[model samples]
Target: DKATIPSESPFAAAEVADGAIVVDIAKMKYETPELHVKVGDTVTWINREAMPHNVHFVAGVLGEAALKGPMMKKEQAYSLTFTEAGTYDYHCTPHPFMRGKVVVE
Candidate 1:
């Protein structure tokens, strides 16, 4: 169901205050495709791959979600704090099939 590869980047610990929602970018997709959390929770998507990947949201999608994130490199990180409650659907522009969702309550 996923791809694997070797990397030199060290593992970055997840955040407890943020529900530890560290969605990994690998296997050509978002590792944690569906994440559940509450308002004010934070989500971090860290790159664990050699290929470039990014997080993107559809126009008009609600919540405190970010509209887009820069394509990240291996070990690179993008952190977004969810201030509002809503469902967030995101995709990678480079790989449309690489989509994910975050549900906040």
Candidate 2:
């Protein structure tokens, strides 16, 4: 079964450019569709939109939103360990429409 959302992120756009992963938060779409990572993968959410953002796992049992909550200016980051294989749904509390999913395998 597949459950999907807008798969939005707070960043601009990220692309696999000529072998390099590049993201210009100020240019592309703020947030990508879905971010798939492995068990020990660390996804960093950098605040480049002049405003601050917080990375929170809707199911906190999997991740944490230990960073800022609102009008943050500095970059905030969160790393989630996919100890098990599952789909983790998450969103930004401030900007509810901003959401994403992490599929672990």
Candidate 3:
């Protein structure tokens, strides 16, 4: 028997690939507030909102250096590869209230 994978999934982004996922950064928020990824997986954040935004990691998640992401314009994106199993929390720089979580295992 043969099976096919649809281009879109109700549970994930349409263009996502194996061990990789897209987190929509739109409307001053992370579309998927919480996410799960295995060690060594890559997560990409795309800005879909009208305003500019950035991804900032919490201290001790990956490292202090990973705290600030490049400011992104609409449709811009940033990606990070998780190398360890741990909980990583992040937020938008300009909008502190916009937060998200990533559990790497």
Candidate 4:
């Protein structure tokens, strides 16, 4: 069902095609934090809360592929494709207790 995927998403078509996975931000935490993906798959975090949130990766662990996402409001989404393969742990910037992990191979 190619229904809700946005037309103006920053992700490229090739990166988003069949390789997209969504993580929902709700209840002051990521619904399912642990994720497994192929090397080039894109993981998008959708903010399900009116409160601000983001995916903030630890710099020391993820190496240069570490990313700190922007603060997201309700109904907003953030997308990123992992070019490198590893187990990367990330959290919400505003609320550090909100943790998540992405295992790419």
Candidate 5:
């Protein structure tokens, strides 16, 4: 059922159909070729694989509260805002090798 997929989160911040920023954390290394948004913009990461993961950003990116995830379930997503201008770096807790970045203007 549609319910199996996690509800469209307040974290998502926009209609899933509206095409939010995509963060491919499934791979060995995180990839975001194009992620452009301003402060207050929200970026959502959708888990599409069997493995679990988290989005742990470097200091101040998540306002000193680091993000951690081992999202074992499919369709589970995590969203965070770009409240300040910086090149934020984050990685999956389960797979420390996997990482990504976001640039807010």
Candidate 6:
């Protein structure tokens, strides 16, 4: 259930289910930078840099709940399932300039 999943925020190449996509965090930037996914699809981010990083969303990005993931260490990963259709803008708390976008359709 969605309620059971941790809202906040993981190592290794996390076991991925079919159709899942991986976004690599390296050099203080998201590899793909911008991603497009269908509703209900999952986006997984893997930290590859030495320093820690996190995925923090803009207001109202995910329903009424604020989406801010925990800092992820190198090789760690975090995943979020998009259920709504819209554009989402997110960034790293430690590095505000590091930004990314998600387009859900």
| Candidate number of the best lDDT | 6
Best by TM-score: 6
Number of clashing pairs, model 1? 0
TM-score of 1: 0.75
Cα displacement (angstroms), candidate 3, residue 3, comes to 34
Per residue, candidate 6 scores C-alpha lDDT tens digits across 27-78 of 8899988899888788888898889998888556665576668888888888
Best-first order by TM-score: 6, 3, 4, 1, 5, 2
Candidate 3 at residue 50, lDDT?
67
* Backbone N/Cα/C clashes per model: 0, 5, 0, 0, 2, 2
Residue pairs clashing, model 5:
53-69, 54-69
Cα lDDT tens digits for candidate 2, 42-104? 454445665555544543435443322233244432233345667766666666566666676
Q: For model 1, what is the error of residue 83's alpha carbon versus the real structure, in angstroms, after optimal superposition?
A: 1.3
lDDT (10s digit) by residue, model 5, range 1-105 = 100113334232233536666665555555673467777676777666667566665555556555453353455666665667767767777676776777788
The lDDT per prediction is 0.68, 0.45, 0.70, 0.70, 0.58, 0.77
Give all TM-scores, in the order shown: 0.75, 0.55, 0.77, 0.76, 0.68, 0.84
- RMSD to truth, every model: 8.5, 8.5, 9.2, 6.9, 7.1, 2.8
Higher-ranked by TM-score: 1 or 4: 4
lDDT of 1: 0.68
lDDT at 1 for candidate 4? 12
What is candidate 4's lDDT per residue for 1-105, written digit by digit as tens? 101223334332234345458887899989888988887676788787789788877656555445566677677777776767778888887788888888888
Off by over 4 Å in 3: 1-19, 64-66
Candidate 1 residues 53-92, lDDT tens each?
8777765664344365677777776766676677878899
